[PDB]
């Protein structure tokens, strides 16, 4: 379903959504089983929580001691679970006429906590729940408009021995260099040396950990300068697709600070933080 097609009819039903993660709150402890201790006889009992309500006892459950209202909650002995709140923004494609994309809040508990990072495309299955909002802190009064959110039950972020036996077969091929150089950029024609140079950058040198000095890194830097119409930008895009991480920065569209890192402040936490530039 689309984020703009959820109606009241579809409340309390299992739906499937896809979107982009925008922001996630830190871990929130959610109580599961409460712990009570009698102030008089030092008797301890555990009571369950139903619908966010503690089934507190009126008086001590022991027979000899029955002092009413003498039970107290020991905060640090109650069982707890994990809770987290995420904000999901619909994919840019779904936007009908170029407006601000809508967002829907999600809740994930236990294992699914810290499963999706900020700025990732995920597909989430959960229950489309509804819940009241209290008009003010100090009253049971409720607003007539209900808040909508999704109770997530599954999240999907959108080597075998057989493969290893297969991979080891290619390495035996005598013309492996040509095969890989021809497969890295199928479309580009008669640039075998350029392709070979590009390929060796993906593999990279060898890493060395080195005390009594500094680390030595096997990273290769390549410059492709030549006449305009030749396939330079095409190879740039082709390699940009293959690599797992990379930023397609251009000329005059990037800044000195923008490449390295930007100093900023976090509004939510009100602390000085720094972002990661294109190079970082």
């Amino acid at each position: 379903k689309g984020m703009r097609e959820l109606n009241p009819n579809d409340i309390d039903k299992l739906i499937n959504l896809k979107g982009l993660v925008l922001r996630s709150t830190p871990v929130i402890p959610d109580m599961k089983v409460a712990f009570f201790k009698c102030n008089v006889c030092d008797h301890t009992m555990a009571v369950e929580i139903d619908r966010g309500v503690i089934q507190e006892p009126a008086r001590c459950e022991r027979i000899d001691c029955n002092e009413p209202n003498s039970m107290s909650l020991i905060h640090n002995r109650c069982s707890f679970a994990d809770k987290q709140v995420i904000k999901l923004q619909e994919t840019p494609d779904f936007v009908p006429d170029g407006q601000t994309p809508h967002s829907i809040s999600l809740c994930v508990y236990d294992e699914l906590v810290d499963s999706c990072r900020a700025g990732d495309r995920i597909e989430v299955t959960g229950t489309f729940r509804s819940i009241p909002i209290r008009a003010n802190s100090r009253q049971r009064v409720l607003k007539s408009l209900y808040k909508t959110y999704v109770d997530v039950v599954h999240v999907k972020k959108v080597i075998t021995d057989q493969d290893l036996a297969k991979i080891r077969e290619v390495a035996a091929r005598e013309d492996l260099y040509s095969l890989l150089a021809r497969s890295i950029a199928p479309s580009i024609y008669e640039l075998e040396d350029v392709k070979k140079g590009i390929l060796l950058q993906l593999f990279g040198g060898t890493n060395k950990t080195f005390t009594k000095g500094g680390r030595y890194r096997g990273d290769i830097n390549i410059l492709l300068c030549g006449d305009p119409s030749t396939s330079k930008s095409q190879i740039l895009q082709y390699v940009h697709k293959i690599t797992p991480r990379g930023v397609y920065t251009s000329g005059k569209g990037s800044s000195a600070v923008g490449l390295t890192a930007y100093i900023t402040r976090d509004v939510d936490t009100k602390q000085l933080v720094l972002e990661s530039g294109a190079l970082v």
């Binding site: 008089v40 006889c41 030092d42 000899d64």
Partner: peptide, 12 residues
């Protein structure tokens, strides 16, 4: 003159 009840520590 007054009504009082007592809770003993040994009862713990």
């Amino acid at each position: 003159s007054f009504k009082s009840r007592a809770l003993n520590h040994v009862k713990k």
